[PDB]
A paper describes a structure:
[name] inhibits both Aurora A and B with an IC50 of 3 nM and has also entered several clinical trials. Interestingly, the crystal structure of Aurora A with [name] shows that this drug binds to the DFG-in, active conformation of the kinase. Our structure was obtained by co-crystalizing Aurora A with [name] and a [name] that binds to the same site as the natural allosteric activator TPX2. Binding of this [name] shifts Aurora A into an inactive conformation, with the DFG-loop in the out conformation. This new structure underscores the plasticity of Aurora A kinase and the ability of [name] to bind to a DFG-out state, in addition to the previously reported DFG-in state. Thus, our structural and kinetic data together support that [name] can bind to both DFG-in and DFG-out state of Aurora A, and emphasizes the need for caution when interpreting single X-ray structures. An extended model, where [name] can bind to both DFGin/out conformations, followed by a common induced-fit step can also not explain the experimental kinetic traces. These failures, together with the lack of a detectable conformational selection step, led to a new model in which both the DFG-in and DFG-out states can bind [name], but only AurAin:AT can undergo an induced-fit step. All data can be globally fit to this model and the overall KD calculated from the corresponding microscopic rate constants (using Equation 5) is in good agreement with the experimentally measured KD. The number of crystals for each structure is one for apo-Aurora A and Aurora A + AMPPCP and two crystals for Aurora A + Mb + [name].
Author numbering:
A (entry chain D): 127 to 278, 289 to 388
B (entry chain A): 127 to 277, 290 to 387
C (entry chain E): 6 to 93
D (entry chain B): 5 to 93
Write the structure that this text describes.
Amino acid sequence: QWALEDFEIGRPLGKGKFGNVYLAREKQSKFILALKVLFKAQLEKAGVEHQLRREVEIQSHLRHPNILRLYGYFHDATRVYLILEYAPLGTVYRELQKLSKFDEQRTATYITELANALSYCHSKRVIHRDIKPENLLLGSAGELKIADFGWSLCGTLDYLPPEMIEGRMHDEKVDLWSLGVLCYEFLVGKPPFEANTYQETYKRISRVEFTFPDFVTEGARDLISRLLKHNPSQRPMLREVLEHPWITANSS
Amino acid sequence: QWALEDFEIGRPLGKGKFGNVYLAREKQSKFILALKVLFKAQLEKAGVEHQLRREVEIQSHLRHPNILRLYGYFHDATRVYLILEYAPLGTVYRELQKLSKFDEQRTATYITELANALSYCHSKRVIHRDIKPENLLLGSAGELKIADFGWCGTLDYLPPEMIEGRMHDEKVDLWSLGVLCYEFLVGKPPFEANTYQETYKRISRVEFTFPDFVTEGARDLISRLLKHNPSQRPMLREVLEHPWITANS
Amino acid sequence: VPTKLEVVAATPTSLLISWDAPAVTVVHYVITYGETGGNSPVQEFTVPGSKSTATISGLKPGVDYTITVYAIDFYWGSYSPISINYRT
Amino acid sequence: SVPTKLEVVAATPTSLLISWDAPAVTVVHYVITYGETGGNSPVQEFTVPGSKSTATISGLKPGVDYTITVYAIDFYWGSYSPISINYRT
Ligand SMILES: O=C(Nc1c[nH]nc1-c1nc2cc(CN3CCOCC3)ccc2[nH]1)NC1CC1
Ligand SMILES: O=C(Nc1c[nH]nc1-c1nc2cc(CN3CCOCC3)ccc2[nH]1)NC1CC1
């Protein structure tokens, strides 16, 4: 059992319209923690309170180095508290918004870590993990941690394959399309299908309309292209992606 | 490029979750239609624009007699307008509120319309269409028309492979079809429980019962449609050729 | 949650309690009551989530009872109870 | 009419500065179209960042009247109902 009176809420770590995340620590042991606060009204109003309750049970029976941990949860009249692992270095979104581009190795390294988790998740039947930059955190040793615990030019459309946006059948092969999109984003600094309006982007995804700048190396240009394919079956396997020469060369 | 000054707004038809709907007529053509008006403020507070904007593009490519038509959309500063087909007979949710349940002739008929609408969606590779009483309208000739836009909850209509968090295919429509047939006959969701933990188990374990006034024909269909393993569920073509609906249509 | 829980009316044979709306969807309330202090295990009955009152019958006069009610959220379980003492 | 305050701030025989009240809403970018009013030659289009509230139009002939239509684009729901004004210079 958990309660709000067992945490020393330190300084905030994020303030948005969907919820707040404060720096906290266990009182008995002084163990640093991350407390994610969400409001039932917004969750109930959006129809996501179920999905949030679904992730809590799913993410409690699985552990992985590159997967943020959920150490419990509690609630009150209006709010819903989540006990999350702490990540000192922050989110890859902010670190990306500052540096804009990553090294050829940092990208190949991030892609290496994400691929391992997706295989660990795709094995347990846990298909589709949102791995957009906003849901990627950086730990003490500079390692990624997928943090899919609810909300947080374009939005979440830039990371979806044609199967999702069109409401068609999807499977574990959507994760590959996300790696290709995210990989393209670390090197170039922007999703490949990003446009000015929702419809414009929707058409570029469904039609697979994107282009590679000149500075994009040849190795990365072969992996990203092998993942961004309309047919989800033509895509590779998470094992083959790990064997790609460009990854094995620059990754770590 | 429609605009608010192109319609003759009139009697209100209802009050949705993110706004209200009105009844209007196309000025330049005198065509009647339903004009759903959703306040952006209520849309952005819950972040549901992309969920509806995505549904718009999906249904925009879908034009079936049993699927509500979306002729176009326009917006202003603080409101988003959806130009929807008109349904003079109201919403099926109102029928279940006035009647509490349907006769096997009305259910088998509605199940026959939906099985067709679902098969049309499968032809376009579109799956998982919400067909709860809320999103079902009644056209002019008693034609059931699906309306997926917005405005327990949907949990009751979710198959056992989606609450558990696993990959799903086109068979989720067979589940919701059987679930829907159960509500039209009984007037209640078959897996409606008190709490989430209880509602989850009953769906994951298929813990439902047939009242005394449920015939063997219907009981057999619902039994066939409500199979834990999606492979064990029937095919839409077989549903249409089921004895229980071939006689009650 | 419930935050308030008073006794609006009572009789030598039964009592009638009431509470406030928690500004949140509640599945249903669990009502437990018994002689405050400790004579034997307490009882437990449920009341729908839409109702804001209950009626416990079968209480002897002159017994400082302790009624406890805790709401249950559909997704997140039970709330923190709110107990109040009353002498029949 | 979004934008609302479509007006002419500055002008000259060569170029022309246009402005409009901030929409107080997230706009991706503005599309401006201008051409000889009354149904003359086709118009000319060019885009403007969604943060700016002004725009410059260069290369005009003095005297002719022009209909300057400004479209405000919303990411999700496309363009608003435009606002046009005639200007002679
Ligand atoms: O769940 C979240 N974040 C976290 C989960 N685990 N740990 C975090 C979090 N939030 C983090 C924020 C920062 C940077 N700030 C400045 C320096 O001191 C720490 C705070 C660094 C690391 C952070 N980690 N959501 C973030 C607020 C939007
Ligand atoms: O999608 C909606 N409406 C419609 C789209 N197309 N057609 C409708 C709609 N809504 C309808 C409602 C009624 C019955 N009521 C009593 C008589 O007049 C006022 C409403 C009848 C027909 C109706 N059609 N949502 C609002 C809550 C109903």
